[PDB]
Amino acid sequence: PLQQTGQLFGGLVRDIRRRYPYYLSDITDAFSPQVLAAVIFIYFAALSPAITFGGLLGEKTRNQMGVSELLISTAVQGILFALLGAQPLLVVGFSGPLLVFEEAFFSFCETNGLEYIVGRVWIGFWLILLVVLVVAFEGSFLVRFISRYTQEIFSFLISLIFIYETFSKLIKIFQDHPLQKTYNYNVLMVPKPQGPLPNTALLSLVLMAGTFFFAMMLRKFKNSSYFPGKLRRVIGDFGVPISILIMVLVDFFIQDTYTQKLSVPDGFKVSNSSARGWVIHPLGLRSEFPIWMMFASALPALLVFILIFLESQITTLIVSKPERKMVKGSGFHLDLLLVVGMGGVAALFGMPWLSATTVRSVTHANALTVMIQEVKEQRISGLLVAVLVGLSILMEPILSRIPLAVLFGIFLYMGVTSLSGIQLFDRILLLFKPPKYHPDVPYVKRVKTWRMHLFTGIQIICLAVLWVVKSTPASLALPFVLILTVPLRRVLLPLIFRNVELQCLDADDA
Amino acid sequence: AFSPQVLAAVIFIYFAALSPAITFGGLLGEKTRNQMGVSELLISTAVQGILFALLGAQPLLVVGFSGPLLVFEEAFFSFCETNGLEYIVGRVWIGFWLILLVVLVVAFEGSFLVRFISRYTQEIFSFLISLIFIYETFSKLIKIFQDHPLQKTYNYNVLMVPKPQGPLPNTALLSLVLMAGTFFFAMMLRKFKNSSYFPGKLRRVIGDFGVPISILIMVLVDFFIQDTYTQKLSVPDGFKVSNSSARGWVIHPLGLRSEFPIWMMFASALPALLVFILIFLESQITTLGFHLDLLLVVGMGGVAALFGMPWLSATTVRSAQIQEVKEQRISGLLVAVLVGLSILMEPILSRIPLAVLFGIFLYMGVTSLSGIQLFDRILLLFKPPKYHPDVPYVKRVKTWRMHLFTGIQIICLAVLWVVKSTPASLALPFVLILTVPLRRVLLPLIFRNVELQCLDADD
Numbered sequence: 001p002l003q004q005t006g007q008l009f010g011g012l013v014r015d016i017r018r019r020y021p022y023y024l025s026d027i028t029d030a031f032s033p034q035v036l037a038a039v040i041f042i043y044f045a046a047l048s049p050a051i052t053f054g055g056l057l058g059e060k061t062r063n064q065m066g067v068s069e070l071l072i073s074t075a076v077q078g079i080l081f082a083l084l085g086a087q088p089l090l091v092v093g094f095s096g097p098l099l100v101f102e103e104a105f106f107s108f109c110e111t112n113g114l115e116y117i118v119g120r121v122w123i124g125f126w127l128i129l130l131v132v133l134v135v136a137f138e139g140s141f142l143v144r145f146i147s148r149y150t151q152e153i154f155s156f157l158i159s160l161i162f163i164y165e166t167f168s169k170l171i172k173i174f175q176d177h178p179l180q181k182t183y184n185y186n187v188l189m190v191p192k193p194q195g196p197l198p199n200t201a202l203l204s205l206v207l208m209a210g211t212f213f214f215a216m217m218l219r220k221f222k223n224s225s226y227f228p229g230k231l232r233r234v235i236g237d238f239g240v241p242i243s244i245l246i247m248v249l250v251d252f253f254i255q256d257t258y259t260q261k262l263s264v265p266d267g268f269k270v271s272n273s274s275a276r277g278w279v280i281h282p283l284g285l286r287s288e289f290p291i292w293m294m295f296a297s298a299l300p301a302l303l304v305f306i307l308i309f310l311e312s313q314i315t316t317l318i319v320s321k322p323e324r325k326m327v328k329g330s331g332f333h334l335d336l337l338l339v340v341g342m343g344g345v346a347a348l349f350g351m352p353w354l355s356a357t358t359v360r361s362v363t364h365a366n367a368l369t370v371m372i373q374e375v376k377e378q379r380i381s382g383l384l385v386a387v388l389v390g391l392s393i394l395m396e397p398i399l400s401r402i403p404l405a406v407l408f409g410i411f412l413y414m415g416v417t418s419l420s421g422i423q424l425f426d427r428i429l430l431l432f433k434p435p436k437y438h439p440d441v442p443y444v445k446r447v448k449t450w451r452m453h454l455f456t457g458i459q460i461i462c463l464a465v466l467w468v469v470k471s472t473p474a475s476l477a478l479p480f481v482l483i484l485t486v487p488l489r490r491v492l493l494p495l496i497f498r499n500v501e502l503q504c505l506d507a508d509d510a
Numbered sequence: 511a512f513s514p515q516v517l518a519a520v521i522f523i524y525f526a527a528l529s530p531a532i533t534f535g536g537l538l539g540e541k542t543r544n545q546m547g548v549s550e551l552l553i554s555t556a557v558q559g560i561l562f563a564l565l566g567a568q569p570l571l572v573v574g575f576s577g578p579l580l581v582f583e584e585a586f587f588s589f590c591e592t593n594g595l596e597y598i599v600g601r602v603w604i605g606f607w608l609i610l611l612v613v614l615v616v617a618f619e620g621s622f623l624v625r626f627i628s629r630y631t632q633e634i635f636s637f638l639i640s641l642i643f644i645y646e647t648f649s650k651l652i653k654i655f656q657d658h659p660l661q662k663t664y665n666y667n668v669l670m671v672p673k674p675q676g677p678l679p680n681t682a683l684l685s686l687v688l689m690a691g692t693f694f695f696a697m698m699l700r701k702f703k704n705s706s707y708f709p710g711k712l713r714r715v716i717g718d719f720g721v722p723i724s725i726l727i728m729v730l731v732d733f734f735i736q737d738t739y740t741q742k743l744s745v746p747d748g749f750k751v752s753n754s755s756a757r758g759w760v761i762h763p764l765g766l767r768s769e770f771p772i773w774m775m776f777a778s779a780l781p782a783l784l785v786f787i788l789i790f791l792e793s794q795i796t797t798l799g800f801h802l803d804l805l806l807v808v809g810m811g812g813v814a815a816l817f818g819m820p821w822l823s824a825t826t827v828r829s830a831q832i833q834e835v836k837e838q839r840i841s842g843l844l845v846a847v848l849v850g851l852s853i854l855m856e857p858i859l860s861r862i863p864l865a866v867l868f869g870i871f872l873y874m875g876v877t878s879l880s881g882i883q884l885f886d887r888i889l890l891l892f893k894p895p896k897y898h899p900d901v902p903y904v905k906r907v908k909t910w911r912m913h914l915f916t917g918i919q920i921i922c923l924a925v926l927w928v929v930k931s932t933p934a935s936l937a938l939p940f941v942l943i944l945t946v947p948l949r950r951v952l953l954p955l956i957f958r959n960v961e962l963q964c965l966d967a968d969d
């Protein structure tokens with residue numbers, strides 16, 4: 001599949017030919033209650049990150065893009081990906097890297113006095129052109145260069161960003177509402193409290209901690225040895241939704257204290273009507289968009305493409321791993337083109353660009369599998385999940401009751417659980433464990449301990465450089481510095497290390 | 511005189527004695543209106559530890575307060591409050607009767623009751639104490655939330671002498687946060703003790719001092735928060751009683767404010783019997799001669815009640831032959847002296863919130879559950895039989911017979927809880943020892959000998 005045919009659009013046409021004949025089979029292959037249960041699993045698996053990321057983005061962007069835009073974008077793009085995608089199992093949704101880039105671009109626009117929502121439109125135009133070119137000359141083969149080194153650095157950095165953002169937002173909540181001897185009660189809160197309030201900071205902290213604790217405990221219960229087993233797994237799958245429900249109820253029955261809630265408009269309306277409308281005028285909303293930025297918003301498009309490409313193609317090669325028995329065709333070229341073109345069109349509409357995310361796609365595959373006898377592949381479950389996510393915006397009364405601290409707890413849970421599968425995290429943990437306790441894994445046995453620690457130290461240096469670039473005003477360059485790790489692994493590490501050490505420390509498929 | 515290793519062990523033993531002493535002292539001071547509190551408990555522990563080190567036959571045994579003693583003290587305080595009696599004077603008379611019981615039992619041979627107490631009663635007792643600890647922690651949290659509810663508006667100038675006269679902001683939520691954090695840190699350091707991280711020596715050292723470290727962490731957290739009120743330990747400045755407005759050091763047996771009823775001077779024999787049963791059960795579950803140490807503990811507790819000081823129990827073991835005996839003597843003496851001198855640390859103790867001690871209370875309650883086969887079978891109640899461990903009472907006993915055994919034990923626990931709730935709470939030790947005839951008579955009727963040998967094992 002990832003072979004340079006040498007013909008224009010060769011990969012895309014090959015994938016579309018591969019997957020077209022199966023269409024009716026996918027439509028009529030669901031025909032069962034297994035799909036009706038996978039729909040319920042993935043609806044929540046997609047809604048929880050959707051609302052968390054929408055809340056964070058609405059807070060940072062001042063609701064230029066928020067929960068409503070994210071929900072509608074996820075729904076519509078999921079419908080399109082279900083009808084047209086080469087791999088319907090892949091679930092398109094806002095991810096951590098996309099949020100990081102969006103924060104960076106919003107900060108850049110604020111510093112440069114530009115309209116963020118219009119710079120995004122121009123970035124979308126450039127992304128469409130870029131993907132047309134990249135798919136013309138097969139560039140999906142570049143995913144081969146993306147080694148475990150860069151994937152691990154990327155995932156670890158995103159998890160660290162999630163954790164730090166959660167705790168920084170909690171610190172901000174405390175700063176806004178400090179623990180005081182006395183409060184000027186009767187403060188006005190039309191948009192938000194104009195002064196410190198009692199019990200707000202501590203209650204938000206308690207809500208966050210409780211949501212995190214309940215999610216973690218249900219995760220542990222999923223893998224426990226309690227209850228009839230099938231029910232144990234059913235409850236474990238519904239862990240994050242149950243924790244959200246529990247903490248939302250706990251907050252709901254405490255009526256006197258104030259905690260900030262999700263900002264959701266009543267119906268299908270933008271989060272901030274005054275700031276923007278449904279359609280974004282490319283030339284400008286309130287003021288002229290600078291000409292130089294129209295041409296200069298191609299490096300940001302390249303960085304966004306780098307992020308989406310890395311995430312989506314890693315997901316595609318994870319799902320297409322032959323161990324999972326992914327019968328039928330999975331197309332890198334078509335998936336990437338569809339995802340990023342839909343993202344650019346959304347950017348025109350003011351809605352976020354999405355990327356095929358690893359966790360939710362893998363969970364969908366696991367839900368739709370049978371025993372490993374086979375995997376039930378359909379485009380009906382994804383379509384129903386997408387339409388349910390779209391209708392979720394209609395449920396404003398429920399959503400407006402959700403505290404933001406609960407979503408911060410879910411954010412922290414997401415980061416901590418994403419930390420699990422990374423071998424960089426395992427080696428960082430081994431930095432503390434004595435050598436006598438080092439597991440029996442290829443890189444522990446076939447590499448001297450101090451050389452393993454040197455490898456992990458170089459990875460940590462790369463992480464520190466990436467974080468410094470995140471904090472500096474040149475935040476947008478972070479994807480480029482991340483891609484710089486590929487040359488580091490393919491050029492410098494061979495000088496620093498021998499081939500067997502790099503084989504063990506960077507093995508793909510383990 | 512003292513080797514560096516002796517000091518190293520003395521620090522661990524001293525902190526292990528001080529943490530429960532402070533927690534129980536704070537709880538008892540809160541319950542008893544400070545008629546008995548942290549100062550009285552500390553001085554009692556110090557003096558009785560000195561005496562038990564010098565005279566006790568088994569020096570490796572550590573004598574201090576305990577959960578059952580706290581339960582009995584609360585029950586007796588409630589009884590006295592209901593019947594309008596002076597709690598401290600009633601304690602004095604209970605101590606008199608305990609001394610009389612000690613001399614009577616010394617006259618007789620004794621040792622016939624020990625062979626009867628089996629794992630059945632020990633496990634029921636331990637599980638009940640753990641449940642009481644957890645329930646009391648949560649109930650005290652609820653009480654704090656009732657005292658300082660979360661409301662939109664608060665009164666600006668509520669009076670803070672002696673304690674807040676009205677609700678305060680951030681008090682309930684901060685107390686909840688402090689207790690939860692103390693519990694979490696103690697649990698995390700307990701896990702870190704049995705982990706693979708860090709060098710072994712440092713890991714074990716940090717695990718040993720997990721409870722003190724968590725207390726210190728949360729005390730600092732609360733100390734740097736200055737504008738929020740949290741209730742603190744009521745510790746007097748010096749070797750003094752908690753509230754001198756209520757009592758002095760030596761208690762007059764005939765009364766302090768009112769005259770102690772004549773009938774109670776005799777009815778205090780039954781509470782003395784119950785105290786003896788409780789202390790004996792504790793010493794039996796701990797040690798497993800013992801008779802001399804148990805009677806010394808009971809006599810010292812009886813003499814201590816004359817001064818309003820709590821009576822203690824022989825908790826459990828602490829962490830050529832003459833050399834080891836003398837070393838244990840010296841270690842016990844040093845630990846007792848340090849516990850006594852720790853009441854001069856009022857500056858530090860007065861800054862410890864009661865919420866931190868509630869977190870430590872919950873930590874003790876939860877940790878005591880480990881190692882109790884009753885808890886293990888209660889957990890097996892909730893697993894399918896395929897995951898049941900490889901233990902003698904799982905392989906050689908049918909699953910439903912084991913479940914019936916555990917259910918009978920749960921019925922015993924429920925009866926104990928009901929008795930503890932009713933105004934008959936003082937009889938709880940007697941109802942506790944009533945599980946001995948149940949094991950010895952009815953269980954054979956309803957169970958086969960092999961099933962009882964496996965489920966209720968000596969070791």
Ligand SMILES: *[C@@H]1O[C@H](CO[C@@H]2O[C@@H](C)[C@@H](O)[C@@H](O)[C@@H]2O)[C@@H](O[C@@H]2O[C@H](CO)[C@@H](O[C@@H]3O[C@H](CO[C@H]4O[C@H](CO)[C@@H](O)[C@H](O)[C@@H]4O)[C@@H](O)[C@H](O)[C@@H]3O)[C@H](O)[C@H]2NC(C)=O)[C@H](O)[C@H]1NC(C)=O
Pocket residue numbers: 543544545744752753754755756757766767
């Ligand atoms: C140290 O001890 C004092 C005094 O304790 C009293 O004396 C000892 C010997 C025992 O007999 C105790 O039972 C006695 O209470 C404690 O002061 C007490 O505080 C409690 C809790 O705040 C008070 O309980 C309230 O009392 C009210 C009924 O009492 C009526 O009579 C008294 C005396 O005239 C009067 O002060 C009061 O206003 C009433 O008229 C009532 O509001 C309510 O139900 C509640 O029970 C108790 O009254 C106090 N005692 C006295 C004598 O004032 C201290 O609390 C303790 N120290 C600490 C740190 O706890």
Ligand SMILES: CCCCCCCC(=O)OC[C@H](COP(=O)(O)O[C@@H]1[C@H](O)[C@H](O)[C@@H](OP(=O)(O)O)[C@H](OP(=O)(O)O)[C@H]1O)OC(=O)CCCCCCC
Pocket residue numbers: 431432433434435436708709710711
């Ligand atoms: C506070 C910072 C630490 C200060 C101290 C500075 C840190 C420091 O000095 O570590 C040296 C240690 C080397 O000691 P070393 O490996 O030879 O000792 C092994 C093990 O660490 C334990 O000492 C023992 O296991 P156990 O547990 O007893 O069963 C065992 O000895 P024993 O079985 O034969 O008796 C040995 O297998 O290296 C690390 O463990 C990694 C620590 C990484 C973290 C270091 C972070 C600096």
Ligand SMILES: CCCCCCCC(=O)OC[C@H](COP(=O)(O)O[C@@H]1[C@H](O)[C@H](O)[C@@H](OP(=O)(O)O)[C@H](OP(=O)(O)O)[C@H]1O)OC(=O)CCCCCCC
Pocket residue numbers: 226227228229230231891892893894895896
């Ligand atoms: C909420 C109500 C839930 C109880 C509903 C009542 C439902 C009920 O009565 O279940 C009986 C169950 C025994 O289940 P049972 O032995 O028939 O089935 C075993 C096991 O439970 C799993 O089904 C499988 O293990 P795994 O995990 O897949 O590896 C395995 O099947 P498989 O390997 O051959 O495929 C079996 O070995 O006993 C309890 O655990 C209940 C604990 C008390 C429940 C306490 C509830 C508070």
Ligand SMILES: CCCCCCCCCCCC(=O)OC[C@H](COP(=O)(O)OCC[N+](C)(C)C)OC(=O)CCCCCCCCCCC
Pocket residue numbers: 170171174175176177178179209687691731735
């Ligand atoms: C398990 C431990 C629980 C600890 C609970 C929190 C105790 C400290 C609260 C002080 C609040 C205060 O005083 O808020 C005020 C202070 C600062 O002062 P300021 O004048 O507002 O400065 C800012 C002036 N602005 C408002 C103009 C910008 O804010 C802080 O520095 C907040 C730091 C505390 C963050 C708590 C997060 C802890 C998470 C731990 C993992 C679950």
Ligand SMILES: CCCCCCCCCCCC(=O)OC[C@H](COP(=O)(O)OCC[N+](C)(C)C)OC(=O)CCCCCCCCCCC
Pocket residue numbers: 206210250254651652655656657658659660682686690
């Ligand atoms: C670690 C988990 C344990 C948590 C238990 C906390 C005890 C709460 C007590 C409620 C009953 C009560 O007395 O509430 C008090 C009032 C009830 O208001 P009212 O009906 O007008 O009565 C007015 C007062 N009364 C009852 C004296 C008449 O409101 C509150 O302050 C409720 C705040 C509850 C917040 C608890 C946060 C839970 C976090 C869980 C995630 C870990």
Ligand SMILES: *[C@@H]1O[C@H](CO[C@@H]2O[C@@H](C)[C@@H](O)[C@@H](O)[C@@H]2O)[C@@H](O[C@@H]2O[C@H](CO)[C@@H](O)[C@H](O)[C@H]2NC(C)=O)[C@H](O)[C@H]1NC(C)=O
Pocket residue numbers: 061062063064115272274275276285286
């Ligand atoms: C909704 O948007 C308003 C207005 O946003 C401004 O106009 C947009 C078209 C775009 O150019 C934005 O960058 C502008 O800020 C927000 O009101 C602003 O709030 C900020 C933050 O406090 C304040 O400094 C500005 O003065 C406000 N500007 C105006 C014109 O009122 C408002 O906060 C947004 N609402 C929500 C709920 O996020």
Ligand SMILES: [Cl-]
Pocket residue numbers: 049093094095096357359360
């Ligand atoms: Cl995601």
